[PDB]
Amino acid sequence: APILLTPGPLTTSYRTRRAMMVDWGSWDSDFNELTASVCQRLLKIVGGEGSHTCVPLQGSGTFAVEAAIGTLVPRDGKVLVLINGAYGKRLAKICEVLQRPFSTLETEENVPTTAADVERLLAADPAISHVALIHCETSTGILNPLEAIAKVVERHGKRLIVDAMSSFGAIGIDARKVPFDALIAASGKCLEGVPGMGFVFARSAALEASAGNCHSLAMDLQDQHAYMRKTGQWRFTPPTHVVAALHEALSQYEEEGGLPARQRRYASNCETLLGEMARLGFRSFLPAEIQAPIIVTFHAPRDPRYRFADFYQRVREKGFILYPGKLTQVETFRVGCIGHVDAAEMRQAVAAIGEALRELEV
Amino acid sequence: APILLTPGPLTTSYRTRRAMMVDWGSWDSDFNELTASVCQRLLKIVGGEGSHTCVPLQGSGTFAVEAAIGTLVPRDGKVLVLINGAYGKRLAKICEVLQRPFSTLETEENVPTTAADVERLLAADPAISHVALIHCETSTGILNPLEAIAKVVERHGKRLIVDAMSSFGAIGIDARKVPFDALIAASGKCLEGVPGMGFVFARSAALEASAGNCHSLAMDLQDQHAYMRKTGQWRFTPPTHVVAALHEALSQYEEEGGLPARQRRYASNCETLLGEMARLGFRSFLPAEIQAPIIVTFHAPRDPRYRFADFYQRVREKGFILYPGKLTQVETFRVGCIGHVDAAEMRQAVAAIGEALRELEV
């Protein structure tokens, strides 16, 4: 099994995988307990103990992003979508599919979404009800300044929907300090669970009033929450093994020292990565002042010999799975620095990368 | 870990769980291969090699049922929903939420949906475009006669959407003999995978023409299929470990002798169950002539001492998790006979049941 240097699904600890060796009953109180501990550990992290509720959902994070747009953004609401990358585009496609009146702020891939340009467009038309953005655009690993953007959004009585899939668990987000109606994350990223379940931190009072709003049965967070309030059970088949794994990964996250411990490791991995790759002659697409310690985009070698598909295949053989580029304009590739990986796996990865290239991109 | 005598999530083999000990890359060709083998093994079973395509989906089977109603049933289409149980009700809620013009045939819980009453209502109004039903209502384990109903539906140029979640893998369904536009199943039932992914066998030509129809991004089987045609990849995060488990469970299903081998075991489990429970003084809710070998509903003991929650708890301690009743009118409970369980675990379960009751329901 190669190490996965991707934005998830990623390399998980074996504790994490062990947890899946157990079959649970979805009706069973033990599983009801498991579910509740997961929700409360999650709600603990985001700092939403008083004001929000953690609604878990089957499927990927996109499922839960849609679920949140669907259940919280009303029929008569306009959303500003910030779109500085691929995740941002998905937000646009989701509002459209839900035919939700919406408006787009595309700010190109190499530069952050600014509080400033969010300010002007908001001032224009009080029509807009909601603002939606991605915290970390994994397409390039740009970190958007959410705290600056949240404050600017709140200052205008508009409401924030934050996609924190790639960043939740690793970049500090505190609910009482970053006002939002919805933060969405998933199981298989910075928390280091396996993939297969999403969750939404929704404001208690927004969700309670959202009864009937959702365009979807399966993705109705109000119906989901209400039923789970009542019975402690999921409406529909839960992915039991995924929830257990996430519970166990949450155990490890707490043991290791929480967000700061997870952030320190990733920041360290991010450095070793940039450090070693620079020493190979690689340029990062982003300079350090904007670079999230989640995933690094690197300019492809100019060498007319360079083939990503080749380069990927040789590095796999040496025990490391990298990630393709996602930019239309300049050829690149990506290396994650997250999951159950330390500074020393990073340098072995770069050393492998170097070896792969010497057969024969120069 | 107790044995799960439920309709799933259920007791899985350990081969199945072992498969999850591996992290896969969603972009990785190995995982692309894994995904394709799963789809083709699935498409093989339902007999849809020539006419249908297996679209896999994240989340539970309900997610894929919605996905199929959403992507295949047009804006200008009326659906007849057959509703002889809880699964049937969900179908009604889904068409409503999708605001799909629809109509209901409720036939009570103890008697099958008949080809005859489907015939009349169809003749009434050619408005109806689609018919939807559950093959096995797990609420009672009634088997609906789908072959009789399919033929009656086809005979009227209407189109069938079949929820086969509880029955697929164990009751014979052949595509060239049972005309349908969509059969939906999931990973965590009669196939004995773990839960966490759905799939839809959609008619090749219906799905190809469904471009844009879906009410959902996440649940758009056309967009999902098209993208997977192109890249061999899932649009969004796949639950890699779930797909691997299902692959491995599909391996075992093929080794053991396919549908007939799976059916023989379950029919045998079903007998031992009925056999032993009768010998305790239990009455099944259904007589043998209608009873699917999936799950058995049993009349609760009349004894004013009887408490399901108590009865459940003691049987758990003895290594068996049963299932609550789901009927509004008469008190019952349910015992599954599916998953990785043989005739001899069935009799140990009944013997435990007997023991649990002797402390002190009489």
From Swiss-Prot, chains A, B:
Transmembrane segments: none annotated. It catalyses: (2-aminoethyl)phosphonate + pyruvate = phosphonoacetaldehyde + L-alanine. It is an enzyme of class 2 (transferase). Its EC number is 2.6.1.37. GO terms for biological process: organic phosphonate catabolic process. Optimum temperature is 50 degrees Celsius. Activity increases from 30 to 50 degrees Celsius, the enzyme is inactive at 70 degrees Celsius. Keywords: Aminotransferase, Pyridoxal phosphate, Pyruvate, Transferase. It comes from the Bacteria. Induction: By 2-aminoethylphosphonic acid. InterPro entries: Aminotrans_V_dom (IPR000192), NH2EtPonate_pyrv_transaminase (IPR012703), PyrdxlP-dep_Trfase (IPR015424), PyrdxlP-dep_Trfase_major (IPR015421), PyrdxlP-dep_Trfase_small (IPR015422), SP_NH2Trfase/AEP_transaminase (IPR024169). Optimum pH is 8.5-9. The modification N6-(pyridoxal phosphate)lysine is found at residue 189. GO terms for molecular function: 2-aminoethylphosphonate-pyruvate transaminase activity. Gene3D superfamilies: Aspartate Aminotransferase, domain 1, Type I PLP-dependent aspartate aminotransferase-like (Major domain). Inhibited by phosphonic acids and very slightly inhibited by aminophosphonic acids. Its cofactor is pyridoxal 5'-phosphate. 1 pyridoxal phosphate per subunit. Belongs to the class-V pyridoxal-phosphate-dependent aminotransferase family. PhnW subfamily. Homotetramer; however this is for an enzyme with a molecular weight of 16500, which is in disagreement with the weight of this protein. Involved in phosphonate degradation. This is 2-aminoethylphosphonate--pyruvate transaminase. It comes from Pseudomonas aeruginosa (strain ATCC 15692 / DSM 22644 / CIP 104116 / JCM 14847 / LMG 12228 / 1C / PRS 101 / PAO1). The gene is phnW.
